[PDB]
Amino acid sequence: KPEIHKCRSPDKETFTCWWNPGTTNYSLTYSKEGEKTTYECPDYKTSGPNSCFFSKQYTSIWKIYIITVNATSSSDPLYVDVTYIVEPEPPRNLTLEVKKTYLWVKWSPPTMEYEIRLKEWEIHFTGHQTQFKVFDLYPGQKYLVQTRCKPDHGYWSRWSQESSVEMPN
Amino acid sequence: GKPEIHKCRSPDKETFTCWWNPGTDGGLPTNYSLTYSKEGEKTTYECPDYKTSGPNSCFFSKQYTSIWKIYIITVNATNQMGSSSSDPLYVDVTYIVEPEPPRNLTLEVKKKTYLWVKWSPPTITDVKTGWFTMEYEIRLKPEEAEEWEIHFTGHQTQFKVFDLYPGQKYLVQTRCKPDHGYWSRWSQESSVEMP
Amino acid sequence: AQHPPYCRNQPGKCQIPLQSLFDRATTVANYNSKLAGEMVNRFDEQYVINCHTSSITTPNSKAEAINTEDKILFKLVISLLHSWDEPLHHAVTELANPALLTKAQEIKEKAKVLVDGVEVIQKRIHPGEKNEPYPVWSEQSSLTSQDENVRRVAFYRLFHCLHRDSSKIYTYLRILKCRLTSC
């Protein structure tokens, strides 16, 4: 039987669902919790193989989508709310400044919670803050630091790209 | 004309006040009068209350206050040697809201430790019905320090701070802004000693 | 097989709760209101309003707004939003020939996203309500006038009225949310 792997949205404006082969032509159909009309996937191309892409014309944050994959033998119907499947982009504008002496870490978003880490890494949940203080670090060492973010009800974004700084000798 | 009028403020988005500044008068006593026009009603009215908000002011109660409307206000000055009117002041009450500070600030502590600040909007502002919408900022720092750290909390009346240094005492203040007006003054400081 | 968090509740069905719907509507409305304020500013730092929606009568004081029946609040929000799609269309065409152009395109798109949600909420609480005709700005051709001055005043009226109506839409949605669910 075919199974729905996962659906994801990068900005609540469009989304994509991926699937896995049942054992054959694969098609994807859906409907909205609201009405009784059925629809077919609007695009099997822009998202690569085995996927369905929903552009702005077919994306709504006001209704639940009931998605199911077919093989010619349906799959288990899946319920999707575009606002709960958001997986953002790493935070941006990461700046590091030395200030007895602590490291002032600062970023900007791409509300959301955040997480910074610095080296097997020392994770720091920061909540809704967009700036963070770190004390008692080793003098004379280059430090690696990254960030992550997550929506109110989403998935974590990948880790940002490394930034370095050096603690005074 | 000489007399000037540029400032009006509303504390709750239900009432408002304007102030005027006298100009050239030549030493003779002058009597002033405020008259205004409201968008949608082709009528001139006289200031409804010159007492409540003090000298050279005009107070508009709830019966006379409507938002999403431009008021055209002018101040007139008359003495035995002449008359002079100010330039017209155009004002939409929707954008002159300057609230009072948040109140009832309380600090509670928290395995891992964190500070949980909580507070409430001024009584005058009706956030419970949804008529008024407020934004908040909190600032904190150790007593033995010279720089404050600011955090914008949006619409929330509580905040969780995660990077406080253990062992010290912290001072905290808060302030609020309507969605489109002016920031209030900072509330009075509260203290807490991190575990 | 999987479902959204909240469908983790007894009712055999699985619809988005009314609380979640009102949350999304008020945050979209809050966003349009910020954008409109930004356009108002940028335009005033570079260059009497008689808005075409003034014909739709609205409660303008707290006493009166709080007293308005929910059926009428919905109607007022839906026709105000419908009324701005054409004027924005004309503005965007003119500005297309900096920043103004970009925010104008966004507010026009989000206003359409927002009316969609307001119709869904309205049909959920009051099945079979119908929305009536809404006003038009006939003088909207002035946004493209060859005369520089008449053109500048056209945009002035446009951004300030756009700012006022964003603000009413957002206040009315907050009132309904506090009354029909949780503030």
Side-chain angles (χ1 to χ4, degrees), chain C residues 2-17:
Chain C
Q2 168 88 88
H3 320 80
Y6 56 73
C7 278
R8 182 81 71 168
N9 293 181
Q10 287 169 289
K13 282 192 179 185
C14 170
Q15 275 224 295
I16 299 168

PDB file of all heavy atoms in Angstrom, chain C residues 2-17:
ATOM      1  N   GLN C   2      -2.214  10.384   9.863  1.00  0.00           N
ATOM      2  CA  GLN C   2      -1.942  11.426  10.849  1.00  0.00           C
ATOM      3  C   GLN C   2      -2.994  12.556  10.753  1.00  0.00           C
ATOM      4  O   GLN C   2      -3.687  12.681   9.739  1.00  0.00           O
ATOM      5  CB  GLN C   2      -0.541  11.986  10.589  1.00  0.00           C
ATOM      6  CG  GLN C   2      -0.234  13.254  11.341  1.00  0.00           C
ATOM      7  CD  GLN C   2       0.323  12.971  12.692  1.00  0.00           C
ATOM      8  OE1 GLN C   2       1.538  12.823  12.848  1.00  0.00           O
ATOM      9  NE2 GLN C   2      -0.557  12.865  13.689  1.00  0.00           N
ATOM     10  N   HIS C   3      -3.121  13.360  11.812  1.00  0.00           N
ATOM     11  CA  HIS C   3      -4.068  14.478  11.829  1.00  0.00           C
ATOM     12  C   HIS C   3      -3.398  15.654  12.528  1.00  0.00           C
ATOM     13  O   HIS C   3      -2.289  15.525  13.041  1.00  0.00           O
ATOM     14  CB  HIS C   3      -5.350  14.128  12.603  1.00  0.00           C
ATOM     15  CG  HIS C   3      -5.851  12.735  12.378  1.00  0.00           C
ATOM     16  ND1 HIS C   3      -5.319  11.637  13.026  1.00  0.00           N
ATOM     17  CD2 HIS C   3      -6.835  12.258  11.576  1.00  0.00           C
ATOM     18  CE1 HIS C   3      -5.953  10.546  12.632  1.00  0.00           C
ATOM     19  NE2 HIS C   3      -6.877  10.895  11.753  1.00  0.00           N
ATOM     20  N   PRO C   4      -4.051  16.831  12.541  1.00  0.00           N
ATOM     21  CA  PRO C   4      -3.421  17.963  13.220  1.00  0.00           C
ATOM     22  C   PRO C   4      -3.623  17.799  14.718  1.00  0.00           C
ATOM     23  O   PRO C   4      -4.579  17.157  15.165  1.00  0.00           O
ATOM     24  CB  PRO C   4      -4.188  19.172  12.686  1.00  0.00           C
ATOM     25  CG  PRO C   4      -4.693  18.708  11.397  1.00  0.00           C
ATOM     26  CD  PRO C   4      -5.150  17.310  11.696  1.00  0.00           C
ATOM     27  N   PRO C   5      -2.732  18.395  15.509  1.00  0.00           N
ATOM     28  CA  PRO C   5      -2.779  18.339  16.957  1.00  0.00           C
ATOM     29  C   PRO C   5      -4.179  18.405  17.545  1.00  0.00           C
ATOM     30  O   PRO C   5      -4.624  17.452  18.179  1.00  0.00           O
ATOM     31  CB  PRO C   5      -1.920  19.527  17.354  1.00  0.00           C
ATOM     32  CG  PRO C   5      -0.838  19.468  16.357  1.00  0.00           C
ATOM     33  CD  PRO C   5      -1.616  19.252  15.072  1.00  0.00           C
ATOM     34  N   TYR C   6      -4.864  19.524  17.322  1.00  0.00           N
ATOM     35  CA  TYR C   6      -6.205  19.758  17.859  1.00  0.00           C
ATOM     36  C   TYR C   6      -7.296  18.766  17.486  1.00  0.00           C
ATOM     37  O   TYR C   6      -8.328  18.724  18.145  1.00  0.00           O
ATOM     38  CB  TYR C   6      -6.672  21.189  17.519  1.00  0.00           C
ATOM     39  CG  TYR C   6      -6.645  21.541  16.038  1.00  0.00           C
ATOM     40  CD1 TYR C   6      -7.598  21.017  15.144  1.00  0.00           C
ATOM     41  CD2 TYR C   6      -5.629  22.361  15.515  1.00  0.00           C
ATOM     42  CE1 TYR C   6      -7.529  21.301  13.760  1.00  0.00           C
ATOM     43  CE2 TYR C   6      -5.554  22.643  14.144  1.00  0.00           C
ATOM     44  CZ  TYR C   6      -6.501  22.110  13.272  1.00  0.00           C
ATOM     45  OH  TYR C   6      -6.395  22.365  11.925  1.00  0.00           O
ATOM     46  N   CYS C   7      -7.104  17.982  16.432  1.00  0.00           N
ATOM     47  CA  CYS C   7      -8.133  17.019  16.069  1.00  0.00           C
ATOM     48  C   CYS C   7      -8.023  15.844  17.015  1.00  0.00           C
ATOM     49  O   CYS C   7      -8.680  14.822  16.853  1.00  0.00           O
ATOM     50  CB  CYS C   7      -7.999  16.573  14.602  1.00  0.00           C
ATOM     51  SG  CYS C   7      -8.756  17.783  13.454  1.00  0.00           S
ATOM     52  N   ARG C   8      -7.188  16.025  18.029  1.00  0.00           N
ATOM     53  CA  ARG C   8      -6.965  15.026  19.060  1.00  0.00           C
ATOM     54  C   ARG C   8      -8.135  15.099  20.067  1.00  0.00           C
ATOM     55  O   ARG C   8      -7.962  14.789  21.250  1.00  0.00           O
ATOM     56  CB  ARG C   8      -5.634  15.339  19.753  1.00  0.00           C
ATOM     57  CG  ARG C   8      -5.213  14.373  20.820  1.00  0.00           C
ATOM     58  CD  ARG C   8      -4.569  13.134  20.240  1.00  0.00           C
ATOM     59  NE  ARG C   8      -3.245  13.387  19.675  1.00  0.00           N
ATOM     60  CZ  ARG C   8      -2.393  12.423  19.320  1.00  0.00           C
ATOM     61  NH1 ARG C   8      -2.727  11.141  19.483  1.00  0.00           N
ATOM     62  NH2 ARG C   8      -1.213  12.734  18.782  1.00  0.00           N
ATOM     63  N   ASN C   9      -9.315  15.521  19.587  1.00  0.00           N
ATOM     64  CA  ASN C   9     -10.526  15.645  20.423  1.00  0.00           C
ATOM     65  C   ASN C   9     -11.794  14.935  19.915  1.00  0.00           C
ATOM     66  O   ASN C   9     -12.159  14.999  18.737  1.00  0.00           O
ATOM     67  CB  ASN C   9     -10.846  17.114  20.700  1.00  0.00           C
ATOM     68  CG  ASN C   9      -9.806  17.778  21.576  1.00  0.00           C
ATOM     69  OD1 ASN C   9      -9.915  18.958  21.905  1.00  0.00           O
ATOM     70  ND2 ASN C   9      -8.788  17.018  21.962  1.00  0.00           N
ATOM     71  N   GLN C  10     -12.454  14.271  20.863  1.00  0.00           N
ATOM     72  CA  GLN C  10     -13.670  13.473  20.679  1.00  0.00           C
ATOM     73  C   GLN C  10     -14.512  13.605  19.414  1.00  0.00           C
ATOM     74  O   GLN C  10     -14.716  12.614  18.706  1.00  0.00           O
ATOM     75  CB  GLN C  10     -14.563  13.625  21.922  1.00  0.00           C
ATOM     76  CG  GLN C  10     -14.013  12.865  23.146  1.00  0.00           C
ATOM     77  CD  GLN C  10     -14.730  13.199  24.449  1.00  0.00           C
ATOM     78  OE1 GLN C  10     -14.577  14.294  24.993  1.00  0.00           O
ATOM     79  NE2 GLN C  10     -15.520  12.254  24.950  1.00  0.00           N
ATOM     80  N   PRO C  11     -15.025  14.810  19.109  1.00  0.00           N
ATOM     81  CA  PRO C  11     -15.837  14.914  17.887  1.00  0.00           C
ATOM     82  C   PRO C  11     -15.297  14.076  16.718  1.00  0.00           C
ATOM     83  O   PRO C  11     -14.153  14.248  16.291  1.00  0.00           O
ATOM     84  CB  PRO C  11     -15.866  16.426  17.604  1.00  0.00           C
ATOM     85  CG  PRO C  11     -14.744  17.001  18.453  1.00  0.00           C
ATOM     86  CD  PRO C  11     -14.763  16.140  19.685  1.00  0.00           C
ATOM     87  N   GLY C  12     -16.129  13.156  16.231  1.00  0.00           N
ATOM     88  CA  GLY C  12     -15.743  12.282  15.135  1.00  0.00           C
ATOM     89  C   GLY C  12     -15.124  12.992  13.945  1.00  0.00           C
ATOM     90  O   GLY C  12     -14.207  12.467  13.306  1.00  0.00           O
ATOM     91  N   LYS C  13     -15.625  14.187  13.638  1.00  0.00           N
ATOM     92  CA  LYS C  13     -15.102  14.966  12.518  1.00  0.00           C
ATOM     93  C   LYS C  13     -13.668  15.424  12.774  1.00  0.00           C
ATOM     94  O   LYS C  13     -12.868  14.735  13.421  1.00  0.00           O
ATOM     95  CB  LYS C  13     -15.975  16.208  12.249  1.00  0.00           C
ATOM     96  CG  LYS C  13     -17.274  15.941  11.494  1.00  0.00           C
ATOM     97  CD  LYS C  13     -17.924  17.237  11.016  1.00  0.00           C
ATOM     98  CE  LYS C  13     -19.201  16.942  10.237  1.00  0.00           C
ATOM     99  NZ  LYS C  13     -19.824  18.159   9.643  1.00  0.00           N
ATOM    100  N   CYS C  14     -13.360  16.603  12.251  1.00  0.00           N
ATOM    101  CA  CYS C  14     -12.049  17.186  12.403  1.00  0.00           C
ATOM    102  C   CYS C  14     -12.017  18.474  11.594  1.00  0.00           C
ATOM    103  O   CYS C  14     -11.600  18.482  10.430  1.00  0.00           O
ATOM    104  CB  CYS C  14     -10.982  16.183  11.940  1.00  0.00           C
ATOM    105  SG  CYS C  14      -9.258  16.766  11.762  1.00  0.00           S
ATOM    106  N   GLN C  15     -12.519  19.546  12.214  1.00  0.00           N
ATOM    107  CA  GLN C  15     -12.529  20.875  11.616  1.00  0.00           C
ATOM    108  C   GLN C  15     -11.638  21.759  12.465  1.00  0.00           C
ATOM    109  O   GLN C  15     -11.382  21.465  13.630  1.00  0.00           O
ATOM    110  CB  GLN C  15     -13.946  21.471  11.555  1.00  0.00           C
ATOM    111  CG  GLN C  15     -14.743  21.038  10.308  1.00  0.00           C
ATOM    112  CD  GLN C  15     -15.515  22.181   9.614  1.00  0.00           C
ATOM    113  OE1 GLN C  15     -16.439  22.759  10.190  1.00  0.00           O
ATOM    114  NE2 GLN C  15     -15.137  22.494   8.369  1.00  0.00           N
ATOM    115  N   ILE C  16     -11.127  22.824  11.866  1.00  0.00           N
ATOM    116  CA  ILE C  16     -10.282  23.747  12.591  1.00  0.00           C
ATOM    117  C   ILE C  16     -11.220  24.414  13.593  1.00  0.00           C
ATOM    118  O   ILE C  16     -12.332  24.801  13.247  1.00  0.00           O
ATOM    119  CB  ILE C  16      -9.690  24.822  11.638  1.00  0.00           C
ATOM    120  CG1 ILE C  16      -8.833  24.155  10.555  1.00  0.00           C
ATOM    121  CG2 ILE C  16      -8.873  25.824  12.426  1.00  0.00           C
ATOM    122  CD1 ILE C  16      -8.443  25.052   9.444  1.00  0.00           C
ATOM    123  N   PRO C  17     -10.802  24.526  14.858  1.00  0.00           N
ATOM    124  CA  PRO C  17     -11.640  25.161  15.879  1.00  0.00           C
ATOM    125  C   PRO C  17     -11.907  26.645  15.549  1.00  0.00           C
ATOM    126  O   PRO C  17     -11.116  27.302  14.869  1.00  0.00           O
ATOM    127  CB  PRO C  17     -10.805  25.000  17.144  1.00  0.00           C
ATOM    128  CG  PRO C  17     -10.027  23.749  16.882  1.00  0.00           C
ATOM    129  CD  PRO C  17      -9.600  23.926  15.458  1.00  0.00           C
TER     130      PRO C  17
END
